[PDB]
Amino acid sequence: AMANVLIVEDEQAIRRFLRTALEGDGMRVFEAETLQRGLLEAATRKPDLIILDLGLPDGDGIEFIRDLRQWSAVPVIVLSARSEESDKIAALDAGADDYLSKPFGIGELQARLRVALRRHAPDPLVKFSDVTVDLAARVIHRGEEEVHLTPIEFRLLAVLLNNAGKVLTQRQLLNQVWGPNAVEHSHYLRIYMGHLRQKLEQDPARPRHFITETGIGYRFML
Amino acid sequence: AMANVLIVEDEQAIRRFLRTALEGDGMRVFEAETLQRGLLEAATRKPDLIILDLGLPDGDGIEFIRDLRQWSAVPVIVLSARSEESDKIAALDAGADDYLSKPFGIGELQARLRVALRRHSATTAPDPLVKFSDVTVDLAARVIHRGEEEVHLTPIEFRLLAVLLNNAGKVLTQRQLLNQVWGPNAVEHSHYLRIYMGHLRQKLEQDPARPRHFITETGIGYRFML
DNA sequence: CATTTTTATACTTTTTTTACACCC
DNA sequence: GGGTGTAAAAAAAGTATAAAAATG
């Protein structure tokens, strides 16, 4: 039916204008003013498309794109005040699908929106032990009943699974789960790795899928 | 592992530019000088991506896109010297996946190519392995195998093995490698190297007493083979 | 209230130290 | 005998888990 579009934008005027324009084209519109709320709404609302303004202060748009790409393949169209090539390349390599420099023609945006939308196999499941993981749907089934992970736990699991077979350093896991401002706190990582092992391993005391690489970091297997 | 990009372009300057851009980050280039030739090769050569210049004189590029879209869903990125948005909208509605207007940089072009290609051509190619005897080493994944089984190395052992692997055949002095494994403060502690090379030897060699890959250069340092 | 962060303590791995055999 | 290879300790660094305090 109607396409669900999530708009992460801090400027009120642009939010209203875009809401008018996109609702006029027959799309259900959701907005977020911050990146964290935008990620939250991305998880809960499951939009078919995300418009993201890089001019958001509270965090980093690239960080948003990466965090989102840890589990979601939803098309992301970025709008920006800058038109510097380095920013385009960075955003696109982070996982963005398109880039527009402000100001732009609304018709062009509608066009690229249609292009992004019309590009749409079931979700890849990761199976190990008796656990079934669906990253795209953010659901995990141990055995046959759903097991609940907290936001940090799920992000950690997503990072580990996306790098299946490869060991990740504590710096990497911390940077990708908590962020750049908390890379000295390896104990966070120990604790939450503990949570994951507790919830998912058949024997939390002796892991067979969430392996400790002593002195380095951690690694998911199978 | 190569991406087959077909460029539809007649002007030699832009074609040169596109060739340097495409060969820039490891791709293969098919060329077509007319729209008809473009369709023909689009079918016969099965490109992973088509870069199409709308500046082509032989006909309408948008109708090229419409004709192509009747039997192919290959990504097409459209180039243009104009920037009138109606042309953009027409091209995108026609079936194009992206639209670049002058002036386009080589970097942004390459980036957008990567974007258009990572939808289908993304299959996660296995990490490159370093092999000798029945030992397998994945530097990226930080995992070592010996036979079917997995061999665990401690961090220092791994740093050492990595440095040795990077310098296969070359003779390393104890000083310059102590400066690379431990650091610039244990440069005289040449006893650590002995016991730890002993660890690499008994962990990896078939006969740890008679090393085939971890050879010692008495007086100067060590040297790794294979 | 669920969740994250701080706090405290038992535990395991790795590094360094220190020891005794080697060998042309 | 200077330079080199196994083995075992003592020392240092790193890890697991619980549980209370803080966050919003």
UniProtKB/Swiss-Prot annotation, chain B:
Positions bearing 4-aspartylphosphate: 53
Keyword Transcription attributed: yes
Keywords in alphabetical order: Cytoplasm, DNA-binding, Phosphoprotein, Transcription, Transcription regulation, Two-component regulatory system
PTM summary: Phosphorylated by KdpD.
Primary gene name: kdpE
One of the record's GO molecular function terms: DNA-binding transcription factor activity
Entry-linked PROSITE patterns: OMPR_PHOB, RESPONSE_REGULATORY
InterPro entries the UniProt entry points to: CheY-like_superfamily, OmpR/PhoB-type_DNA-bd, Sig_transdc_resp-reg_receiver, WalR-like, WH-like_DNA-bd_sf
Function: Member of the two-component regulatory system KdpD/KdpE involved in the regulation of the kdp operon.
UniProt subcellular location: Cytoplasm
Gene3D superfamilies: 3.40.50.2300, 6.10.250.690, Winged helix-like DNA-binding domain superfamily/Winged helix DNA-binding domain
SMART domains linked to this entry: REC, Trans_reg_C
DNA-binding region: 127-226
GO cellular component, one term: protein-DNA complex
Keyword Phosphoprotein part of the UniProt annotation: yes
Upper classification of the organism: Bacteria, Pseudomonadati, Pseudomonadota, Gammaproteobacteria, Enterobacterales
SUPFAM superfamilies found in the cross-reference section: CheY-like (SSF52172)
Protein name: KDP operon transcriptional regulatory protein KdpE
Top-level taxon in the UniProt lineage: Bacteria
One Gene Ontology biological process: regulation of DNA-templated transcription
